[PDB]
């Protein structure tokens, strides 16, 4: 079935100490999150650059890692019910806060953790290049050659287009209908590895370290080993849902060239351009497209998705 | 059928002279071992690092070869009957001892050669990337597409997780049942190339250069061209079997990222975590996981295994 | 009386940060251990090298500290009853775990903490070179000149031969009789500072950070300030006792030359060689001899020993 | 059908000028050879090294190109009838001599051009990694999945073991029977790309620039633009056939590791070792194994071979 998605977002200093700290803290956080039976996996991203749209963002390029002073992380966790995410954080708060707070020394902005529902998904299981022979053999043995997927390689061996959209109130249905038609046509582009549309349903205050006064002071004063009061979150997840409605169009690609020209198919192929124009007519903001590297991931979230 | 496994273990200086000596002496030892008809192949490993488990072993990394002052070798030989290994050593002692003793100038610890029975094996034949087209065609022509394996590349083009376990006396059946259930579920991870469970049955004194007093002095005094008395081994293979019972869980992977996150599936995927927890409850020691490079190998041992 | 000995073993990166951490954390751990009235002292060792036995381990030398990428520690704590060690760990768990876990960032292997009984001891009190005049005067005034010991200098000013043995099941009495006869003759070598024979009685799971599943996850997920459940150790100390039976022959020497040629007396002096040959005939493994520097120590453990 | 093979052999200075002239002269010679309708293709090799057989040739390694002062070339041309090669040389002598003579400035030894019959061949068509999808589709459409070959990549993207043998007079039948059995078993080795056995039938005097006195002086005196008398070759091809009988066992491999351990299967796998021992018992010389890079080739010779 379709899981819910929590996306923990933050900006940190782009230096080895940041990546060293992620190598030790990151796995621990994932192991704590896996204590909850509603956890179905994760996909953690480093932003490597920004899609320039020709020279609309002429100061950007798809890989800015050599020049950038910061690194943005977008850490997806997948949940049977979005309430499982909230329960997990509270049930494991003493571990989670102390682990997550240990990254504060590198932090420039965040954490900010919106929660999303998946309204469309065309996402395959990941396979390494070593696996495809057995996948093909099994699918043919089952008489299901149409179920043979593209090779979507895990652990940093593909790239993600993370396309931010906000929609004019009252045009959500037009946006959703047109973006699904767009993605159904986009899958013909070479190197397309899958797409999904995420629709924001709210924000996790506890995952964003957004408390009332009491917890705010406890966060600011923390030596690192004392939990803020997890009951001092002042709003539920849906209370923080944004209007204009926010969406993420998440598209995976074999490499950054396939991403650039593949996403570009909505501008360059006349039939698709007419369809995608219906998306553009509904927007308050966007599309703004971040280029992401999916490095650490728990690939079994796609097994839950595809049943 | 399942062969027995002898694993010759040693630690040597990490310097070019060590790898030069292995390039010339190593093949000679393998050729002598192949004189016995019970020999069914071999798989020789260099340890490249240690799995850090987040930062549980924070001084370790999966590839420590650039910094390490030593190199550990784990040389598997496969036998129709473990007694064939003992007979081979004695029948060819003048060659084997003089070849193996020539390594002494580089040696820091070893040799130590435990013997194992295989209690579980899910291991494919090795294939190079050039081979899969013919393998696929042959299996389909035979009507056995389910027998098409993953591509497990020989000669250093994959990695091994070598997981050491010792088990509380009386919990061996619980360990064995649970680890098999774990490995049957682990094979869904991307880049999984196979697994087997080795259970120690004893130690080869002659393969470990472990003699009584007479042979000990002959080893220490040796100019290099005089054999110690091979009859001066004071214990049979089973007499040295350890209690607590020792196991090796040997899992092969496409690359070190697939290894790290694939092995991590027993921690990150809740359903598998519950199964693997039954393994953890039985342990005196472990899991301690060495990262191995299978460089020199006689791949036909898997043909014997898979018949 | 003879205390029991717990030996905490670990391997860490050989870099200044490791020795800095030991200079601050080490004393803290010792002070916590001293909270228990059954604690009678300690003797902490750095391995400086390996005895090469001519060129049997030709890649080794007695001092490998300049080249080695790792450092092995062997931390002896002495106890009136071995159960005191287990009680101390649990009574002081919140301090001990957090202190010991702070070493994890430097750790490659360990901790592993076997427990031993002393079956033979000929070990003097330590004295500095400044002390011997008062020791001599006191012993003569008491009419006990035979109780004047050799000068065994504390705090890194002597060396230890740490000789590992494992014994064929059924040959333990032969080993023990012969090694005692050997050590009674070895004390004639110049620079001999004492010897003792340690016989393994089990392993401390809590001291080895070896828990069931619950504690294992708590260790891996730990931010550093949360204790694993100390009741989640799944085995008692005796349940982990190894067969083949393990022994440590611990011999102290004025310097590494006295060690090399003094230990060599069991090979070079014919009458002693015949006696020590009876030891060699009983072995599954060994002798493998580590060269240790006893740097930080609580010398009063020898006062308890010698009453 | 099986073509005949002419192998032009020479040794030249290992310097850029040699490879420059080969980049210009080599294609011209091949274009001239293709003027004859009996020409069915070619496969030109650079020797990159020598198989050391452990340390039997301890001064050798499989890739000596960085240290070698010379480069050996082995240029295979394939012919419907070996007489076609002789006719081609004479019909096109003014071009061929002047082209081939232009390499003399770099030459140390050669040219020497023995002629061979193929007595056994298991050689696939070459395919690039881009081609295999269409090859698989075509073979399944023909209902012949057993005809799907391994991927044997052209133009320097595989390696050749060139194994020289000379056979005791009267043992030719034993050699030929046993080598065919050996190669039929060797094809199980990973990365095996094909094998063929070439049996010398004679030597091309004209291709070897081996004339009588008249042509010898014309070669030595040549300014580069005057042909020696092509009728001054004093021996026919069969008149130069060697006794002891010479063979080449030509085996192709995915890479040099697959070659080393794959060819080693005749020494390391007991069942194959027994078969290959029947080859060894017949030899005057060899096996001596050159490691070759097949760079420039006309791959259609395998289309002729395979019908
Ligand atoms: Fe969260
Ligand atoms: Fe052996
Ligand atoms: Fe302890
Ligand atoms: Fe020719």
mmCIF file of C-alpha atoms in Angstrom, chain A:
data_model
loop_
_atom_site.group_PDB
_atom_site.id
_atom_site.type_symbol
_atom_site.label_atom_id
_atom_site.label_comp_id
_atom_site.label_asym_id
_atom_site.label_seq_id
_atom_site.Cartn_x
_atom_site.Cartn_y
_atom_site.Cartn_z
ATOM 1 C CA UNK A 1 0.000 0.000 0.000
ATOM 2 C CA UNK A 2 0.975 3.664 -0.156
ATOM 3 C CA UNK A 3 2.838 4.719 3.003
ATOM 4 C CA UNK A 4 2.916 8.195 4.474
ATOM 5 C CA UNK A 5 6.185 10.130 4.200
ATOM 6 C CA UNK A 6 7.939 12.300 6.774
ATOM 7 C CA UNK A 7 10.719 14.435 5.283
ATOM 8 C CA UNK A 8 13.206 15.788 7.807
ATOM 9 C CA UNK A 9 14.911 18.808 6.230
ATOM 10 C CA UNK A 10 18.008 20.646 7.433
ATOM 11 C CA UNK A 11 20.954 22.710 6.211
ATOM 12 C CA UNK A 12 24.443 22.075 7.624
ATOM 13 C CA UNK A 13 28.024 23.190 7.051
ATOM 14 C CA UNK A 14 29.540 21.532 3.965
ATOM 15 C CA UNK A 15 32.655 20.109 5.592
ATOM 16 C CA UNK A 16 34.017 16.649 6.492
ATOM 17 C CA UNK A 17 32.936 16.954 10.146
ATOM 18 C CA UNK A 18 29.318 17.078 8.954
ATOM 19 C CA UNK A 19 29.656 13.938 6.846
ATOM 20 C CA UNK A 20 31.642 12.162 9.567
ATOM 21 C CA UNK A 21 28.911 12.903 12.105
ATOM 22 C CA UNK A 22 26.255 11.615 9.695
ATOM 23 C CA UNK A 23 28.210 8.365 9.311
ATOM 24 C CA UNK A 24 27.793 7.619 13.039
ATOM 25 C CA UNK A 25 24.584 9.418 14.028
ATOM 26 C CA UNK A 26 22.567 8.661 10.895
ATOM 27 C CA UNK A 27 22.555 4.868 11.230
ATOM 28 C CA UNK A 28 21.681 5.133 14.928
ATOM 29 C CA UNK A 29 18.668 7.334 14.213
ATOM 30 C CA UNK A 30 17.462 4.874 11.579
ATOM 31 C CA UNK A 31 17.875 1.966 14.000
ATOM 32 C CA UNK A 32 15.810 3.785 16.633
ATOM 33 C CA UNK A 33 13.097 4.611 14.095
ATOM 34 C CA UNK A 34 12.929 0.906 13.149
ATOM 35 C CA UNK A 35 11.810 0.079 16.708
ATOM 36 C CA UNK A 36 8.250 0.947 15.648
ATOM 37 C CA UNK A 37 6.239 -1.655 13.683
ATOM 38 C CA UNK A 38 4.658 1.032 11.489
ATOM 39 C CA UNK A 39 8.093 1.933 10.112
ATOM 40 C CA UNK A 40 8.415 0.613 6.565
ATOM 41 C CA UNK A 41 11.729 2.122 5.502
ATOM 42 C CA UNK A 42 13.565 5.280 4.612
ATOM 43 C CA UNK A 43 15.429 7.150 1.899
ATOM 44 C CA UNK A 44 17.947 9.810 2.953
ATOM 45 C CA UNK A 45 19.149 12.439 0.474
ATOM 46 C CA UNK A 46 21.976 14.947 0.172
ATOM 47 C CA UNK A 47 21.214 17.863 -2.102
ATOM 48 C CA UNK A 48 23.956 18.080 -4.732
ATOM 49 C CA UNK A 49 22.631 21.046 -6.705
ATOM 50 C CA UNK A 50 19.755 22.922 -8.320
ATOM 51 C CA UNK A 51 18.255 22.548 -11.791
ATOM 52 C CA UNK A 52 19.125 25.820 -13.586
ATOM 53 C CA UNK A 53 16.278 25.797 -16.195
ATOM 54 C CA UNK A 54 18.639 27.120 -18.843
ATOM 55 C CA UNK A 55 19.881 30.241 -17.068
ATOM 56 C CA UNK A 56 16.713 31.060 -15.114
ATOM 57 C CA UNK A 57 18.832 30.137 -12.095
ATOM 58 C CA UNK A 58 22.086 30.973 -13.838
ATOM 59 C CA UNK A 59 24.092 30.861 -10.636
ATOM 60 C CA UNK A 60 23.069 27.243 -10.076
ATOM 61 C CA UNK A 61 24.157 23.951 -11.560
ATOM 62 C CA UNK A 62 23.102 20.368 -11.021
ATOM 63 C CA UNK A 63 26.257 19.560 -9.018
ATOM 64 C CA UNK A 64 27.353 22.417 -6.741
ATOM 65 C CA UNK A 65 29.040 20.208 -4.122
ATOM 66 C CA UNK A 66 32.570 21.400 -4.873
ATOM 67 C CA UNK A 67 31.709 25.088 -4.383
ATOM 68 C CA UNK A 68 28.863 25.096 -1.852
ATOM 69 C CA UNK A 69 29.438 26.165 1.747
ATOM 70 C CA UNK A 70 26.371 24.214 2.932
ATOM 71 C CA UNK A 71 24.747 20.829 2.435
ATOM 72 C CA UNK A 72 20.994 20.275 2.617
ATOM 73 C CA UNK A 73 19.640 16.922 3.793
ATOM 74 C CA UNK A 74 16.140 15.624 3.063
ATOM 75 C CA UNK A 75 15.550 12.437 5.050
ATOM 76 C CA UNK A 76 12.415 10.507 4.056
ATOM 77 C CA UNK A 77 10.902 8.066 6.508
ATOM 78 C CA UNK A 78 7.945 5.928 5.435
ATOM 79 C CA UNK A 79 5.046 4.961 7.689
ATOM 80 C CA UNK A 80 1.964 2.758 7.500
ATOM 81 C CA UNK A 81 0.038 5.552 9.244
ATOM 82 C CA UNK A 82 1.451 9.042 9.709
ATOM 83 C CA UNK A 83 0.423 8.785 13.358
ATOM 84 C CA UNK A 84 3.027 6.004 13.702
ATOM 85 C CA UNK A 85 5.741 8.598 13.057
ATOM 86 C CA UNK A 86 4.429 10.776 15.885
ATOM 87 C CA UNK A 87 4.139 7.802 18.226
ATOM 88 C CA UNK A 88 7.644 6.591 17.340
ATOM 89 C CA UNK A 89 9.200 9.974 18.169
ATOM 90 C CA UNK A 90 7.504 10.095 21.568
ATOM 91 C CA UNK A 91 8.076 6.439 22.502
ATOM 92 C CA UNK A 92 11.805 6.773 21.728
ATOM 93 C CA UNK A 93 12.270 10.438 22.605
ATOM 94 C CA UNK A 94 15.211 10.053 24.997
ATOM 95 C CA UNK A 95 17.241 8.305 22.289
ATOM 96 C CA UNK A 96 15.986 10.340 19.319
ATOM 97 C CA UNK A 97 16.411 13.793 20.840
ATOM 98 C CA UNK A 98 19.921 13.070 22.099
ATOM 99 C CA UNK A 99 20.992 11.617 18.741
ATOM 100 C CA UNK A 100 19.389 14.373 16.659
ATOM 101 C CA UNK A 101 20.572 17.147 18.959
ATOM 102 C CA UNK A 102 24.158 15.896 18.575
ATOM 103 C CA UNK A 103 24.119 17.372 15.040
ATOM 104 C CA UNK A 104 23.346 20.904 16.282
ATOM 105 C CA UNK A 105 27.034 21.902 16.140
ATOM 106 C CA UNK A 106 26.909 21.632 12.327
ATOM 107 C CA UNK A 107 23.426 23.056 11.812
ATOM 108 C CA UNK A 108 22.538 26.266 10.033
ATOM 109 C CA UNK A 109 18.776 25.764 9.544
ATOM 110 C CA UNK A 110 16.301 23.098 10.597
ATOM 111 C CA UNK A 111 15.166 20.539 11.403
ATOM 112 C CA UNK A 112 11.845 21.027 9.636
ATOM 113 C CA UNK A 113 9.736 17.886 9.162
ATOM 114 C CA UNK A 114 6.591 18.182 7.042
ATOM 115 C CA UNK A 115 4.433 15.084 6.613
ATOM 116 C CA UNK A 116 2.968 14.008 3.258
ATOM 117 C CA UNK A 117 0.438 11.654 1.765
ATOM 118 C CA UNK A 118 1.324 9.913 -1.483
ATOM 119 C CA UNK A 119 -1.384 10.630 -4.059
ATOM 120 C CA UNK A 120 0.435 8.966 -6.992
ATOM 121 C CA UNK A 121 3.266 6.443 -7.122
ATOM 122 C CA UNK A 122 5.051 4.700 -9.988
ATOM 123 C CA UNK A 123 8.133 3.530 -8.075
ATOM 124 C CA UNK A 124 9.978 0.209 -8.567
ATOM 125 C CA UNK A 125 11.945 -1.901 -6.144
ATOM 126 C CA UNK A 126 15.647 -1.074 -6.168
ATOM 127 C CA UNK A 127 18.044 -3.581 -7.675
ATOM 128 C CA UNK A 128 21.800 -3.669 -8.061
ATOM 129 C CA UNK A 129 23.274 -4.518 -11.462
ATOM 130 C CA UNK A 130 24.096 -7.964 -10.033
ATOM 131 C CA UNK A 131 20.420 -8.733 -9.390
ATOM 132 C CA UNK A 132 18.697 -8.320 -12.742
ATOM 133 C CA UNK A 133 19.398 -11.826 -14.094
ATOM 134 C CA UNK A 134 17.499 -13.435 -11.211
ATOM 135 C CA UNK A 135 14.708 -10.848 -11.397
ATOM 136 C CA UNK A 136 14.216 -11.532 -15.111
ATOM 137 C CA UNK A 137 14.309 -15.289 -14.552
ATOM 138 C CA UNK A 138 11.759 -15.139 -11.739
ATOM 139 C CA UNK A 139 9.363 -12.824 -13.591
ATOM 140 C CA UNK A 140 9.406 -14.980 -16.727
ATOM 141 C CA UNK A 141 8.922 -18.122 -14.627
ATOM 142 C CA UNK A 142 5.810 -16.458 -13.145
ATOM 143 C CA UNK A 143 4.573 -15.474 -16.609
ATOM 144 C CA UNK A 144 4.813 -11.767 -15.710
ATOM 145 C CA UNK A 145 7.389 -10.171 -18.050
ATOM 146 C CA UNK A 146 5.549 -6.833 -17.794
ATOM 147 C CA UNK A 147 6.524 -6.778 -14.108
ATOM 148 C CA UNK A 148 10.243 -6.603 -14.949
ATOM 149 C CA UNK A 149 11.309 -3.143 -13.713
ATOM 150 C CA UNK A 150 14.014 -0.782 -14.817
ATOM 151 C CA UNK A 151 17.267 -1.138 -12.866
ATOM 152 C CA UNK A 152 17.013 1.497 -10.106
ATOM 153 C CA UNK A 153 20.316 1.152 -8.296
ATOM 154 C CA UNK A 154 20.409 1.861 -4.542
ATOM 155 C CA UNK A 155 22.916 3.683 -2.352
ATOM 156 C CA UNK A 156 23.893 6.774 -4.301
ATOM 157 C CA UNK A 157 23.884 5.195 -7.759
ATOM 158 C CA UNK A 158 21.013 7.265 -9.236
ATOM 159 C CA UNK A 159 19.725 10.836 -8.817
ATOM 160 C CA UNK A 160 16.448 12.458 -7.766
ATOM 161 C CA UNK A 161 14.619 15.516 -9.091
ATOM 162 C CA UNK A 162 12.813 17.071 -6.101
ATOM 163 C CA UNK A 163 10.305 19.502 -7.650
ATOM 164 C CA UNK A 164 8.601 21.919 -5.241
ATOM 165 C CA UNK A 165 5.134 23.246 -6.122
ATOM 166 C CA UNK A 166 2.549 25.309 -4.269
ATOM 167 C CA UNK A 167 -0.934 25.504 -5.774
ATOM 168 C CA UNK A 168 -3.511 28.317 -5.982
ATOM 169 C CA UNK A 169 -6.371 27.566 -3.541
ATOM 170 C CA UNK A 170 -9.195 25.975 -5.501
ATOM 171 C CA UNK A 171 -6.901 24.587 -8.226
ATOM 172 C CA UNK A 172 -5.691 21.498 -6.329
ATOM 173 C CA UNK A 173 -7.820 19.136 -8.412
ATOM 174 C CA UNK A 174 -6.577 20.648 -11.676
ATOM 175 C CA UNK A 175 -2.976 20.365 -10.457
ATOM 176 C CA UNK A 176 -3.354 16.755 -9.332
ATOM 177 C CA UNK A 177 -5.088 15.595 -12.518
ATOM 178 C CA UNK A 178 -2.561 17.314 -14.777
ATOM 179 C CA UNK A 179 0.570 16.253 -12.877
ATOM 180 C CA UNK A 180 -0.482 12.595 -12.975
ATOM 181 C CA UNK A 181 -1.106 12.828 -16.732
ATOM 182 C CA UNK A 182 2.307 14.496 -17.027
ATOM 183 C CA UNK A 183 4.113 11.752 -15.103
ATOM 184 C CA UNK A 184 2.325 9.004 -17.039
ATOM 185 C CA UNK A 185 3.817 10.514 -20.206
ATOM 186 C CA UNK A 186 7.203 11.322 -18.659
ATOM 187 C CA UNK A 187 7.958 7.661 -18.003
ATOM 188 C CA UNK A 188 8.840 7.264 -21.710
ATOM 189 C CA UNK A 189 11.995 9.379 -21.253
ATOM 190 C CA UNK A 190 15.270 7.395 -21.242
ATOM 191 C CA UNK A 191 16.667 6.704 -17.785
ATOM 192 C CA UNK A 192 13.360 7.321 -15.996
ATOM 193 C CA UNK A 193 13.423 5.304 -12.766
ATOM 194 C CA UNK A 194 10.061 6.220 -11.235
ATOM 195 C CA UNK A 195 7.970 9.086 -9.882
ATOM 196 C CA UNK A 196 5.651 9.905 -7.022
ATOM 197 C CA UNK A 197 3.603 12.929 -5.959
ATOM 198 C CA UNK A 198 3.650 13.905 -2.282
ATOM 199 C CA UNK A 199 0.908 16.161 -0.893
ATOM 200 C CA UNK A 200 1.588 17.894 2.411
ATOM 201 C CA UNK A 201 -0.824 16.997 5.231
ATOM 202 C CA UNK A 202 0.895 18.825 8.085
ATOM 203 C CA UNK A 203 4.138 19.254 9.988
ATOM 204 C CA UNK A 204 5.635 17.274 12.882
ATOM 205 C CA UNK A 205 6.357 19.826 15.602
ATOM 206 C CA UNK A 206 8.321 17.262 17.588
ATOM 207 C CA UNK A 207 10.407 16.285 14.562
ATOM 208 C CA UNK A 208 11.015 19.986 13.887
ATOM 209 C CA UNK A 209 12.049 20.765 17.492
ATOM 210 C CA UNK A 210 9.172 23.249 17.547
ATOM 211 C CA UNK A 211 7.856 23.363 21.121
ATOM 212 C CA UNK A 212 6.075 25.889 23.266
ATOM 213 C CA UNK A 213 8.068 28.176 25.532
ATOM 214 C CA UNK A 214 9.024 25.384 27.937
ATOM 215 C CA UNK A 215 10.548 23.062 25.335
ATOM 216 C CA UNK A 216 12.151 25.956 23.452
ATOM 217 C CA UNK A 217 14.123 26.921 26.551
ATOM 218 C CA UNK A 218 15.003 23.276 27.210
ATOM 219 C CA UNK A 219 16.359 22.982 23.650
ATOM 220 C CA UNK A 220 18.400 26.184 23.887
ATOM 221 C CA UNK A 221 19.774 25.293 27.333
ATOM 222 C CA UNK A 222 20.474 21.645 26.632
ATOM 223 C CA UNK A 223 23.886 20.161 27.508
ATOM 224 C CA UNK A 224 22.938 17.333 25.120
ATOM 225 C CA UNK A 225 21.689 14.668 27.568
ATOM 226 C CA UNK A 226 18.348 16.093 28.809
ATOM 227 C CA UNK A 227 15.115 15.735 26.864
ATOM 228 C CA UNK A 228 12.773 18.669 26.336
ATOM 229 C CA UNK A 229 9.230 17.883 27.419
ATOM 230 C CA UNK A 230 7.825 15.997 24.387
ATOM 231 C CA UNK A 231 4.303 16.925 25.545
ATOM 232 C CA UNK A 232 5.081 20.630 25.022
ATOM 233 C CA UNK A 233 4.355 20.517 21.290
ATOM 234 C CA UNK A 234 1.540 23.016 20.878
ATOM 235 C CA UNK A 235 0.014 21.902 17.563
ATOM 236 C CA UNK A 236 -1.064 18.695 15.888
ATOM 237 C CA UNK A 237 0.331 17.649 12.532
ATOM 238 C CA UNK A 238 -2.730 18.813 10.500
ATOM 239 C CA UNK A 239 -2.848 22.197 12.256
ATOM 240 C CA UNK A 240 0.423 23.129 10.533
ATOM 241 C CA UNK A 241 -0.671 22.123 7.013
ATOM 242 C CA UNK A 242 0.075 24.949 4.602
ATOM 243 C CA UNK A 243 -2.349 26.843 2.382
ATOM 244 C CA UNK A 244 -1.395 27.363 -0.498
ATOM 245 C CA UNK A 245 -1.237 23.583 -0.695
ATOM 246 C CA UNK A 246 2.309 22.283 -1.076
ATOM 247 C CA UNK A 247 3.344 19.304 -3.207
ATOM 248 C CA UNK A 248 6.577 17.530 -4.009
ATOM 249 C CA UNK A 249 6.951 15.914 -7.415
ATOM 250 C CA UNK A 250 9.690 13.333 -6.826
ATOM 251 C CA UNK A 251 11.220 11.845 -10.005
ATOM 252 C CA UNK A 252 14.161 9.437 -10.125
ATOM 253 C CA UNK A 253 16.675 9.218 -12.975
ATOM 254 C CA UNK A 254 19.658 7.139 -14.073
ATOM 255 C CA UNK A 255 22.003 10.165 -14.035
ATOM 256 C CA UNK A 256 21.937 13.961 -14.075
ATOM 257 C CA UNK A 257 21.882 14.217 -17.895
ATOM 258 C CA UNK A 258 18.858 11.927 -18.103
ATOM 259 C CA UNK A 259 17.330 14.079 -15.353
ATOM 260 C CA UNK A 260 17.970 17.376 -17.147
ATOM 261 C CA UNK A 261 16.724 16.300 -20.573
ATOM 262 C CA UNK A 262 14.128 13.900 -19.184
ATOM 263 C CA UNK A 263 12.490 16.502 -16.975
ATOM 264 C CA UNK A 264 13.002 18.802 -19.970
ATOM 265 C CA UNK A 265 10.649 16.575 -21.978
ATOM 266 C CA UNK A 266 7.762 18.547 -20.433
ATOM 267 C CA UNK A 267 9.150 21.623 -22.223
ATOM 268 C CA UNK A 268 10.636 20.084 -25.363
ATOM 269 C CA UNK A 269 8.066 17.510 -26.517
ATOM 270 C CA UNK A 270 5.031 19.444 -27.833
ATOM 271 C CA UNK A 271 2.367 16.897 -26.813
ATOM 272 C CA UNK A 272 3.712 16.682 -23.256
ATOM 273 C CA UNK A 273 4.255 20.453 -23.093
ATOM 274 C CA UNK A 274 0.531 21.034 -23.683
ATOM 275 C CA UNK A 275 -0.325 18.643 -20.834
ATOM 276 C CA UNK A 276 2.234 20.074 -18.439
ATOM 277 C CA UNK A 277 1.056 23.611 -19.219
ATOM 278 C CA UNK A 278 -2.093 22.698 -17.272
ATOM 279 C CA UNK A 279 0.120 22.104 -14.211
ATOM 280 C CA UNK A 280 1.859 25.465 -14.632
ATOM 281 C CA UNK A 281 -1.421 27.402 -14.765
ATOM 282 C CA UNK A 282 -2.254 26.312 -11.181
ATOM 283 C CA UNK A 283 0.932 27.324 -9.337
ATOM 284 C CA UNK A 284 1.602 29.952 -6.699
ATOM 285 C CA UNK A 285 5.244 28.888 -6.421
ATOM 286 C CA UNK A 286 7.478 26.635 -8.466
ATOM 287 C CA UNK A 287 8.512 24.477 -10.043
ATOM 288 C CA UNK A 288 11.775 24.760 -8.109
ATOM 289 C CA UNK A 289 13.848 21.633 -8.638
ATOM 290 C CA UNK A 290 16.520 20.372 -6.231
ATOM 291 C CA UNK A 291 18.956 17.682 -7.400
ATOM 292 C CA UNK A 292 19.309 15.011 -4.722
ATOM 293 C CA UNK A 293 21.579 12.037 -4.143
ATOM 294 C CA UNK A 294 19.785 9.144 -2.359
ATOM 295 C CA UNK A 295 22.709 7.665 -0.390
ATOM 296 C CA UNK A 296 21.529 5.879 2.762
ATOM 297 C CA UNK A 297 18.216 4.125 2.277
ATOM 298 C CA UNK A 298 16.142 1.213 3.495
ATOM 299 C CA UNK A 299 15.006 -0.096 0.142
ATOM 300 C CA UNK A 300 12.257 -2.298 1.582
ATOM 301 C CA UNK A 301 9.931 0.724 1.664
ATOM 302 C CA UNK A 302 9.320 0.006 -2.025
ATOM 303 C CA UNK A 303 8.458 -3.608 -1.191
ATOM 304 C CA UNK A 304 5.725 -2.287 1.094
ATOM 305 C CA UNK A 305 4.611 0.122 -1.644
ATOM 306 C CA UNK A 306 4.406 -2.511 -4.381
ATOM 307 C CA UNK A 307 3.067 -5.369 -2.216
#
